[PDB]
């Protein structure tokens, strides 16, 4: 089955899933020369006061950190986006060292890592339904650099030691994810896709332009994890990023000058 592995990897990914050739796949480098300022975007409007986490995951290629999606809490509007979209999960993918990692590229640079704030269209109804859209998920995309200490990530790698391995999960109630989120709100978006198997075009991508900061020792902490399932061979949880893909017929929108 897919993976990041030298026969299972990104290159391998379209026998199985032919869309990995497709229109509008994700990741993409931002070329920032590019990308147009478009003065019709409206601010994001993040809503995650009332965010429920439930649970983190281990699902074999990274980490998912669960929500409440049963109820109109924790949602994304504005921006580019038509209608409001619920938080369903997080999760990130990173590198093996700290000068690569990220999915998304700025002018070609790499970061350490990015996070991802998977939210599905609520006229769709689940997360399910929504995948079969085009217009179902708004993916909230925030790089992660290597500095000062993120302290709001502090109790996500706490509980990581409890998933070490594949299928793993534990109970992770009262996460609030507005720790996770740089002071500007500014971003570059164009239409694409999940950046994992099953790779479904659904997705309207918000990447913001500041990076938070992460410590060594945060990101040192995710490396430390598992592909592999428990009682088999160790491979370290490092480098799940799909690098970037053609832009094609696609046009990077600025919401700021
Ligand atoms: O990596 C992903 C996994 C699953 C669901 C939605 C989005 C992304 S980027
Ligand atoms: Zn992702």
């Avoid at 650099?145 to 109630?173: C, E, N, R, Y």
Wanted: net charge neutral; charged share 25%; hydrophobic share 35%.
């Amino acid at each position: 089955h897919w993976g990041y592995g030298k026969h299972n990897g990104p290159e391998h990914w379209h026998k199985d899933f032919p869309i990995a050739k497709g229109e509008r796949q994700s990741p993409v480098d931002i070329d920032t020369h590019t990308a147009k300022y478009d003065p019709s975007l409206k601010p994001l409007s993040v809503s995650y006061d009332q965010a429920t986490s439930l649970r983190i995951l281990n699902n074999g290629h990274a980490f998912n950190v669960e929500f409440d999606d049963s109820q109109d809490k924790a949602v994304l509007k504005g921006g580019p986006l038509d209608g409001t979209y619920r938080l369903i999960q997080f999760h990130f993918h990173w590198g093996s060292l700290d000068g690569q990692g990220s999915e998304h590229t700025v002018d070609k640079k790499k970061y350490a890592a990015e996070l991802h704030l998977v939210h599905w269209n609520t006229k769709y109804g689940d997360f399910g339904k929504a995948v079969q859209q085009p217009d179902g998920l708004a993916v909230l995309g925030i790089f992660l650099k290597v500095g000062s200490a993120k302290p709001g990530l502090q109790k996500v790698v706490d509980v990581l030691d409890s998933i070490k391995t594949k299928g793993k999960s534990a109970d992770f109630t009262n996460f609030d994810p507005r720790g996770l989120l740089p002071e500007s709100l500014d971003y570059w978006t164009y239409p694409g896709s999940l950046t994992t198997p099953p790779l479904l075009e659904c997705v309207t991508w918000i990447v913001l332009k500041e990076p938070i900061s992460v410590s060594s020792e945060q990101v040192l902490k995710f490396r430390k994890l598992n592909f592999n399932g428990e009682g088999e061979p160790e491979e370290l949880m490092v480098d799940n990023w799909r690098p970037a893909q053609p832009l094609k017929n696609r046009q990077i929108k600025a919401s700021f000058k």
